[PDB]
Write a protein that binds this ligand. Structure first.
Ligand code: QDW
Length: 864
């Protein structure tokens, strides 16, 4: 008590939902989750508080390595010892490991301080100055992202020697405070009693459409009520009998409802699991608080609408199918039934038919019959074809499900790629999901981080609160502070969505039990975001009444207040926990002229020097979820290309929704839009004789002498990357104001509100302004242009080879409820852009035709 009461009030404020609201529900599923997950997260907390000092560096500052390093050249480094003004600058090689650098700094200190030190290089770690980032382990310096960045930008790495006792003092201070169905052969049936708080046109009639689903797949035909006159409280009091026995209902069977008005006018929909969280087949009266429709929705949540006051409610009755409670058979009873079967002793000709269709993904009924018959052969010689076999399994026949389950329980572990496919709502079985998680345990923290966003969306397909995916995500989050950081923010940003608020709020509470210190760290971030919202509202009001210089001076005065200076300063960035947002640079803060007046907040850090000069963009009113997905997809391409030794110098900057139409974007400094550069302002070092000269002149002024060639090369590489990225993703609405260029020459895209050709197929784009720079400012430079076409081809063929990874990830994102990622049609776009139904030669020929057709469109600007 007292500390417990304080933690409870801090979790409530952090998650944006009072913990008392969980207790008011009086829900045993909610109560069992809270107790079990608190227990699981506190065990993780205790494991962590006793980690070795290097293990605790791995928890708190996971290594940031180059994609080529996962799984020569001279370098100048600056090293100081913790809390010392004195630093040493020395020459090392990119091939040297941190230990060699540390042993060298220790020899330098020993000679300066005139004593042979007690300390060995094994006792230290190198912190990147003013950053929550460390260099450690047996990796050459070039394999670290920080060193790599310093090399490309020519800057000097600045490192601090941190002794193991100082790391241990970090661990210690951050501590959690001290403490039988199968005999029921009758057809499935329900009583549709009545409707409540129903709003519809009195000239029409009300109908309830009802279906039995196992994921998206129907277990039998849909059934409908009789038409009853429209009113607030319609009364059906009728029996709805489905064509499927009670014994054949799979574990993950859901009963789906849709209420509508007819002369079709959709009103509401509601779903429920037929078995509870404790495997008991549901009986008795159920009051279903319906969700308003935008006709059956099986992917929809199986929990009632919390707004009980305004929601239309359907009252149903689940009949007593037995005198005693009926539970779903345990795994031992399932195995014993499915263990008995017949193996596919079939001809060598039909074996060639099977091999063909398993390596080939829709298939004709006779092929489904053959796949099912040859299921033993599928397990033994094609284990990666599990997803195809699971789709041919008859989920409405309990004996077929037992036979599938028996094979799954002895199925070998699958690659991460195959596992991600199995998390799709198309594989709704709980043992399948459990198996998918089992095959994902081998994900590295870097891979997990790359797919975290999609795994969090998968939580919306879960039928129960306590699931293997929640346990997996919590355990990985409590084992890695960066995973924990982003898991929190992905959950927090959806607390305003009623369908997920309970599930997401419960996961965040469990996590907080696991890391009291991190809760306080995220509270610091939440307080800055609260002040940014109040600051932005002020700007939106102030900007409609006065001029921008007046609103800017006001925003500054508001920021200069004690409460603002305190809340806005000294925090870890929500976009990147490695980034410390130290002193807010009020004078450099401003806002944009657009409708929502986004804020531009600048920071500085004495300790980080030039690297501490960072900015964040705060947006309130705009929805940044699609931008975040596109930027994560661009970053994925960048990793995939770097794994083949192809660095296209991309700028996948941070973008993170943090709340309801609220989020942050990472400022990329030393950059300007193509439109600003092309405005061709007079009395500037870039003023052009021809508007086409503007970008190159601007590049010339920023990169004098020999630096220009490096800048043209960076432009060319990034240009090839973004031409491929925008084409594959179907990024449209591309204009001079949503294309940026860095002083280094790097081109990058911004504002991804429209993707996947949003509906019209986006053609490959090539601009003459960009062609002019690639060609070093020459009319004819085929050597340079075709070297650019080589980069686009190479980048495109690498992406194609990971085509299925993009497909599986985008299929998982359908759960996000993004207006441009709703159906199969939206993903056909990525299937076409990657030309996945073709050979590498057929696809490359298609890309060439698409690139050439974009070169002719480009020449309509050149001709003038
Ligand atoms: C979806 O919106 C955005 N996406 C990316 C960027 C900015 C915005 N919005 S904005 O701040 O209103 C436009 C700022 N404009 C000066 C151009 C600019 C400059 C630097 C940027 C940037 C936009 N990005 C993120 C990277 O850093």
């Amino acid at each position: 008590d007292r500390v417990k009461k304080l933690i409870n009030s801090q979790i409530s404020l952090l998650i944006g939902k009072g913990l008392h609201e969980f207790d008011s529900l009086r829900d045993p599923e909610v109560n069992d989750f809270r107790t079990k997950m608190r227990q699981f997260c506190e065990e993780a907390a205790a494991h962590r508080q006793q980690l070795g000092w290097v293990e605790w560096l791995q928890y708190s500052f996971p290594l940031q390595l180059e994609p080529s390093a996962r799984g020569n050249r001279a370098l100048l480094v600056n090293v100081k010892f913790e809390g010392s003004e004195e630093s040493f600058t020395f020459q090392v090689s990119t091939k040297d490991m941190p230990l060699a650098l540390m042993a060298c700094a220790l020899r330098k200190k020993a000679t300066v301080f005139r004593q042979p030190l007690v300390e060995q290089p094994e006792e230290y770690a190198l912190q990147v100055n003013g950053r929550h980032e460390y260099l450690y382990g047996n990796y050459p310096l070039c394999h670290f992202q920080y060193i790599c960045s310093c090399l490309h930008s020519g800057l000097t790495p600045h490192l601090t020697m941190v002794h193991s006792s100082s790391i241990l003092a970090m661990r210690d201070e951050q501590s959690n405070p001290a403490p039988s169905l199968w005999s029921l052969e009758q057809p499935f049936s329900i009583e549709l009693i009545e409707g409540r708080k129903v709003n519809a046109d009195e000239r029409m009639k009300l109908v309830v459409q009802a279906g039995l689903f196992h994921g998206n797949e129907m277990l039998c035909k849909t059934v409908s009520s009789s038409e009853v006159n429209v009113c607030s409280e319609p009364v059906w009091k009728q029996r709805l009998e489905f064509d499927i026995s009670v014994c054949d209902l799979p574990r993950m069977a859901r009963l789906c409802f849709a209420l509508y008005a007819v002369v079709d006018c959709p009103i509401a929909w509601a779903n429920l699991m037929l078995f509870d969280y404790k495997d008991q087949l549901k009986t008795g009266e159920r009051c279903l608080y319906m969700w308003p429709s935008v006709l059956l929705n099986p992917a929809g949540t199986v929990r009632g609408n919390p707004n009980t006051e305004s929601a239309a409610a359907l009252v149903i009755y689940l009949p007593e199918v037995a005198p005693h409670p009926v539970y779903f058979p345990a795994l031992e009873k399932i195995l014993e039934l499915g263990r008995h079967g017949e193996r596919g002793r079939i001809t060598e000709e039909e074996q060639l038919q099977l091999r063909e269709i398993l390596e080939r993904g829709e298939l004709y009924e006779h092929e489904k019959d053959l796949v099912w018959k040859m299921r033993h052969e599928v397990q033994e010689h094609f284990p990666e074809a599990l997803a195809r076999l699971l789709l041919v399994t008859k989920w409405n026949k309990h004996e077929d499900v037992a036979q599938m389950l028996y094979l799954l329980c002895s199925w070998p572990e699958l690659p991460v790629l195959s596992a991600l496919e199995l998390l799709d709502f198309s594989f709704p079985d709980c043992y399948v999901g459990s198996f998918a998680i089992k095959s994902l345990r081998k994900l590295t923290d870097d891979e997990l981080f790359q797919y975290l966003l999609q795994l969090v969306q998968v939580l919306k397909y879960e039928s129960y609160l306590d699931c293997e995916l929640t346990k997996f995500l919590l355990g990985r989050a409590l084992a890695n502070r960066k995973i924990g950081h982003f898991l929190f923010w992905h959950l927090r940003s959806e607390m305003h969505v009623p369908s997920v608020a309970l599930r997401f709020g419960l996961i965040m509470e469990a996590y907080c039990r696991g890391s009291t210190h991190h809760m306080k760290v995220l509270m610091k971030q939440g307080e800055a975001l609260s002040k940014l919202k109040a600051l932005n509202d002020f700007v939106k009001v102030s900007s409609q009444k006065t001029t921008k210089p007046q609103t800017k001076e006001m925003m500054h005065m508001c920021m200069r207040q004690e409460t603002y200076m305190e809340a806005l300063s000294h925090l870890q960035s929500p976009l990147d926990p490695s980034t410390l947002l130290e002193e807010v640079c009020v004078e450099q803060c401003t806002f944009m002229d657009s409708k929502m007046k986004p804020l531009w907040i600048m920071y500085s850090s004495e300790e980080a020097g030039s690297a501490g000069n960072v900015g964040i963009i705060f947006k309130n009113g705009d929805d940044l979820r699609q931008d975040m997905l596109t930027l994560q997809m661009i970053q994925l391409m960048d990793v995939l290309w770097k794994q083949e030794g192809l660095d296209l110098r991309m700028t996948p900057y941070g973008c993170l929704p943090t709340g309801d139409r609220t989020g942050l974007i990472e400022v990329v400094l030393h950059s300007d839009t193509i439109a600003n550069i092309q405005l061709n302002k007079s009395n500037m070092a870039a003023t052009a004789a021809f508007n086409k000269d503007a970008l190159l002149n601007w590049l010339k002024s920023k990169n004098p002498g020999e630096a220009l060639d490096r800048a043209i090369e960076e432009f060319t590489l990034s240009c090839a990357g973004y031409c491929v990225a925008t084409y594959v993703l179907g990024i449209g609405d591309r204009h001079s104001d949503n294309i940026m260029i860095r002083e280094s020459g790097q081109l990058f895209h911004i504002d991804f509100g429209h993707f996947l050709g949003n509906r019209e197929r986006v053609p490959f784009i090539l601009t003459y302004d960009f062609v002019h720079v690639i060609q070093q400012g020459k009319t004819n430079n085929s050597e340079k242009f075709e070297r650019f076409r080589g980069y686009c081809e190479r980048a495109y063929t690498i992406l194609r080879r990971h085509g299925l990874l993009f497909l599986h990830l985008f299929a998982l994102m359908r759960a996000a409820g993004l207006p441009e990622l709703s159906c199969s049609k939206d993903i056909q776009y990525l299937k076409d852009s990657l030309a996945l139904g073709k050979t590498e030669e057929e696809a490359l020929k298609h890309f060439r035709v698409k690139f050439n057709e974009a070169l002719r469109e480009s020449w309509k600007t050149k001709v003038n």
